[PDB]
Amino acid sequence: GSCKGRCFELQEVGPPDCRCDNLCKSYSSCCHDFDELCLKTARGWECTKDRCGEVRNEENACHCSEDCLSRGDCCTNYQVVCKGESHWVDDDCEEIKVPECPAGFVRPPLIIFSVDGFRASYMKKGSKVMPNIEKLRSCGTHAPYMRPVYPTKTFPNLYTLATGLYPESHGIVGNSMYDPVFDASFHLRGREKFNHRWWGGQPLWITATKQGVRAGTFFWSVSIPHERRILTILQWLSLPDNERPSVYAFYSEQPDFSGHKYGPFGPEMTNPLREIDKTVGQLMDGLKQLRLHRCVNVIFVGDHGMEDVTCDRTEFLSNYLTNVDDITLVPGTLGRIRAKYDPKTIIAALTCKKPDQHFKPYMKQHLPKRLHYANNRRIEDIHLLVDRRWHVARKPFQGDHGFDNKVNSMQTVFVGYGPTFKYRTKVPPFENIELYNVMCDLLGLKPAPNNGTHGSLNHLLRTNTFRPTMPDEVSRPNYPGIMDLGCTCDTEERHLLYGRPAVLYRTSYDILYHTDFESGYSEIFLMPLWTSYTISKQAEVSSIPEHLTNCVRPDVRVSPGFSQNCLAYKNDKQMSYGFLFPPYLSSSPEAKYDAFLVTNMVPMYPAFKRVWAYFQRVLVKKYASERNGVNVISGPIFDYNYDGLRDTEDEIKQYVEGSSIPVPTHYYSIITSCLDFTQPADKCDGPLSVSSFILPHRPDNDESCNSSEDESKWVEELMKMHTARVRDIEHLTGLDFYRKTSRSYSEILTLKTYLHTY
Numbered sequence: 001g002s003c004k005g006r007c008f009e010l011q012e013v014g015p016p017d018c019r020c021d022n023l024c025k026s027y028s029s030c031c032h033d034f035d036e037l038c039l040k041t042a043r044g045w046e047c048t049k050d051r052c053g054e055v056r057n058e059e060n061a062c063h064c065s066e067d068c069l070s071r072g073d074c075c076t077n078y079q080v081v082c083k084g085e086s087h088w089v090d091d092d093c094e095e096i097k098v099p100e101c102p103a104g105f106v107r108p109p110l111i112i113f114s115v116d117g118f119r120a121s122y123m124k125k126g127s128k129v130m131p132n133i134e135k136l137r138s139c140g141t142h143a144p145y146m147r148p149v150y151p152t153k154t155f156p157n158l159y160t161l162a163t164g165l166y167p168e169s170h171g172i173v174g175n176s177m178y179d180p181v182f183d184a185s186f187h188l189r190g191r192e193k194f195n196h197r198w199w200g201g202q203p204l205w206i207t208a209t210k211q212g213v214r215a216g217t218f219f220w221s222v223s224i225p226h227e228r229r230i231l232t233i234l235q236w237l238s239l240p241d242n243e244r245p246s247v248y249a250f251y252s253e254q255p256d257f258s259g260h261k262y263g264p265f266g267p268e269m270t271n272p273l274r275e276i277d278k279t280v281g282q283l284m285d286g287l288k289q290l291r292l293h294r295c296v297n298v299i300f301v302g303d304h305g306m307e308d309v310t311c312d313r314t315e316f317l318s319n320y321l322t323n324v325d326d327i328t329l330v331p332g333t334l335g336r337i338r339a340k341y342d343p344k345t346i347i348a349a350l351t352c353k354k355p356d357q358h359f360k361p362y363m364k365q366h367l368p369k370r371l372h373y374a375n376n377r378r379i380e381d382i383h384l385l386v387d388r389r390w391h392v393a394r395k396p397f398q399g400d401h402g403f404d405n406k407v408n409s410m411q412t413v414f415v416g417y418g419p420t421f422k423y424r425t426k427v428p429p430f431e432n433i434e435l436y437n438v439m440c441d442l443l444g445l446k447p448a449p450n451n452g453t454h455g456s457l458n459h460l461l462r463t464n465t466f467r468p469t470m471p472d473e474v475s476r477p478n479y480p481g482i483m484d485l486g487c488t489c490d491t492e493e494r495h496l497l498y499g500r501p502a503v504l505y506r507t508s509y510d511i512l513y514h515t516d517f518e519s520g521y522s523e524i525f526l527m528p529l530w531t532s533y534t535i536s537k538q539a540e541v542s543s544i545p546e547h548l549t550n551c552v553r554p555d556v557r558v559s560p561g562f563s564q565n566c567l568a569y570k571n572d573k574q575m576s577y578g579f580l581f582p583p584y585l586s587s588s589p590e591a592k593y594d595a596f597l598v599t600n601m602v603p604m605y606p607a608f609k610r611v612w613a614y615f616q617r618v619l620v621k622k623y624a625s626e627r628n629g630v631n632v633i634s635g636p637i638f639d640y641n642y643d644g645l646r647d648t649e650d651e652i653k654q655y656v657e658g659s660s661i662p663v664p665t666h667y668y669s670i671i672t673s674c675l676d677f678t679q680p681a682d683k684c685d686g687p688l689s690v691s692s693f694i695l696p697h698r699p700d701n702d703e704s705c706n707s708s709e710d711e712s713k714w715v716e717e718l719m720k721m722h723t724a725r726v727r728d729i730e731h732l733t734g735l736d737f738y739r740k741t742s743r744s745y746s747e748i749l750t751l752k753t754y755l756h757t758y
């Protein structure tokens with residue numbers, strides 16, 4: 001029942017025997033002698049010139065005796081003060097090609113240095129403010145910024161880094177949450193958070209343990225100081241080969257605490273940032289002292305940013321809502337409403353009431369698809385998006401975080417230093433869901449199913465272990481020739497520049513050729529899955545004639561039993577039709593007749609037509625003149641169950657009144673051109689440029705408060721909000737793009753993960 005020769009033990013003991021680990025403090029199960037044996041304060045954490053050459057006393061924190069090197073308990077500045085050597089930061093920058101680890105090391109260890117609320121723009125401060133951080137940034141691999149996950153809070157973000165999944169999948173959807181099945185509530189302060197029922201998926205420490213790789217403790221008790229944490233890691237690295245782990249983690253509550261109080265632009269922010277660098281300095285000098293400085297791989301990462309938020313700028317529900325006393329709300333930078341009733345009337349009372357209104361109400365299903373925040377029992381149906389610098393409350397500090405993940409102030413940091421990372425290079429910004437696959441590859445582990453694209457971060461490391469491959473095509477297409485119904489009317493490698501998309505599921509479809517476009521018509525869903533066309537900068541927009549307004553002509557390649565009809569839309573009081581290829585952008589008046597075919601017809605509400613027509617008539621040509629030619633691929637999306645994955649025929653819930661024509665939930669479009677704007681889209685030499693969208697198929701424009709005004713005032717702003725990656729479209733459609741290219745497959749995977757933020 002003592003902690004003698006058991007301090008910070010990797011194995012968990014009891015019950016009922018008292019524990020001597022770095023987690024016992026939170027569970028309140030440590031021995032009485034734990035505080036005396038394991039935690040030592042005496043004579044500080046710094047070795048002085050007058051302390052050099054001393055006799056070992058078993059009461060002091062860190063030792064300054066000659067016999068400390070053989071043990072592994074010297075102070076961080078022992079070799080600098082006593083031996084008379086230089087600090088790691090003062091030494092010149094030298095290349096690390098091969099890991100300089102001692103004999104007996106199977107794999108080079110990884111240390112994760114996570115900092116709370118470190119805004120990406122703090123790095124812009126001088127080298128004299130943060131000298132140890134500026135060396136790691138300039139010598140190793142670094143990115144200007146890193147995108148966090150929504151909500152931009154501590155708990156959903158840190159657990160995302162450890163699993164590689166979205167919060168809707170891992171279970172931790174926020175710092176404060178309620179589960180209807182368990183009938184219990186998860187909070188920041190309480191003993192409920194300690195239960196294993198809330199935490200899902202497979203974290204990094206389990207993945208290592210299951211594959212015969214020893215993993216140290218990730219969670220630290222609040223009472224354990226920053227200096228003692230750095231000392232414990234350096235003590236664990238001196239243990240024998242059969243005892244010492246291969247992965248360690250460090251956590252810091254700052255600069256988040258001093259950021260919430262003073263604000264991101266406050267002059268008081270300089271000093272807490274200086275202490276962070278001092279802790280980094282202690283670790284690097286410690287690694288140099290143990291001669292492990294050219295062996296270990298180190299990561300400096302964050303979780304979210306910081307924005308100027310005050311008491312004066314707050315929106316109250318009592319100024320909008322009917323009762324308010326009968327409801328429950330998760331307040332602050334986001335809003336979630338539930339009962340203690342009709343949700344139809346609650347949204348209606350919150351829609352564009354005040355002119356300068358600083359919040360938008362949503363149903364979890366109608367949120368921008370890029371957020372990935374709906375499919376979970378813990379996520380409330382009524383959701384509220386809050387504007388930057390603002391707060392939301394039920395009824396009646398200089399900083400806060402938790403807003404949209406595309407907000408500039410919410411962006412975080414990333415620095416990769418070690419023998420596996422690239423030397424003196426800079427990489428473009430990436431998303432935090434991609435880290436789990438890199439950490440797994442750095443330790444030589446097989447990752448569990450996660451939401452990352454394996455191979456998209458291969459440009460970061462000098463020596464890659466994983467090589468990505470293309471998925472095989474499941475369904476092969478048909479090439480039909482030639483062979484009522486209420487409808488009346490009075491080179492092909494130029495349109496598909498990057499190869500035809502492959503179908504990854506069991507279906508029956510056929511390819512169709514036209515002078516201005518090319519498509520993949522599905523006989524199961526009676527409409528195409530995609531349509532490809534190219535528009536140059538020289539091209540001009542043509543007007544839609546009067547005699548060809550209600551013109552729909554039958555297709556001779558497709559059977560009448562596997563095609564749409566004009567009678568279905570005539571009988572449907574709420575539905576109308578549109579076209580995937582714009583008739584406005586035709587080569588000749590004869591070629592305009594191809595655009596009005598029944599195989600190019602798609603179901604669209606009259607309210608959505610305002611958005612789709614402005615994009616086709618005005619916006620497409622605008623992009624072609626700026627980007628020097630563009631390549632467009634557009635089609636439909638069905639996602640009723642809101643799981644972000646392609647719906648089966650049994651999962652379709654809406655059809656055109658009296659028929660078997662399905663109604664899409666969303667409409668996608670991919671715009672590709674050459675990265676070198678001096679070159680045209682059809683004559684590209686090197687890399688490409690991309691921008692995509694996932695527009696919702698809504699029967700009203702209530703999302704746009706200025707929808708009463710002309711299209712040139714509200715349309716483009718809506719498209720920017722509903723921006724998406726190529727990978728997002730791929731999950732909702734089951735298609736695989738960019739097949740035939742003169743580029744590397746790794747370059748394609750990076751392009752498929754790009755998000756245009758504007």
Ligand SMILES: *[C@@H]1O[C@H](CO)[C@@H](O[C@@H]2O[C@H](CO)[C@@H](O[C@@H]3O[C@H](CO)[C@@H](O)[C@H](O)[C@@H]3O)[C@H](O)[C@H]2NC(C)=O)[C@H](O)[C@H]1NC(C)=O
Binds near residue numbers: 165451643644731
């Ligand atoms: C992001 O990644 C997660 C994990 O890889 C994806 O979730 C997994 O997908 C399926 C369907 O949602 C889940 O259930 C499975 O269903 C079949 C039905 O035939 C059944 O045999 C099993 O019950 C099977 O497990 C699976 O449990 C689930 N895992 C987790 C942890 O959620 C998710 O769909 C991805 N999101 C994207 C790509 O947007």
Ligand SMILES: *[B-](O)(O)c1ccc(COc2ccc(/C=C3\SC(=O)N(Cc4ccc(F)cc4)C3=O)cc2)cc1
Binds near residue numbers: 112116153159220249
């Ligand atoms: B934030 O909103 O600014 C915020 C909210 C609450 C708090 C409360 O204080 C703590 C203190 C410690 C921790 C530690 C955690 S949470 C977690 O998942 N892990 C495990 C881990 C995952 C990934 C990783 F890289 C390292 C560790 C912890 O150790 C949370 C909140 C503070 C800030």
Ligand SMILES: [Ca+2]
Binds near residue numbers: 645646647651
């Ligand atoms: Ca689905």
Ligand SMILES: [Zn+2]
Binds near residue numbers: 117153154
């Ligand atoms: Zn945080």
Ligand SMILES: [Zn+2]
Binds near residue numbers: 117260
């Ligand atoms: Zn915080």
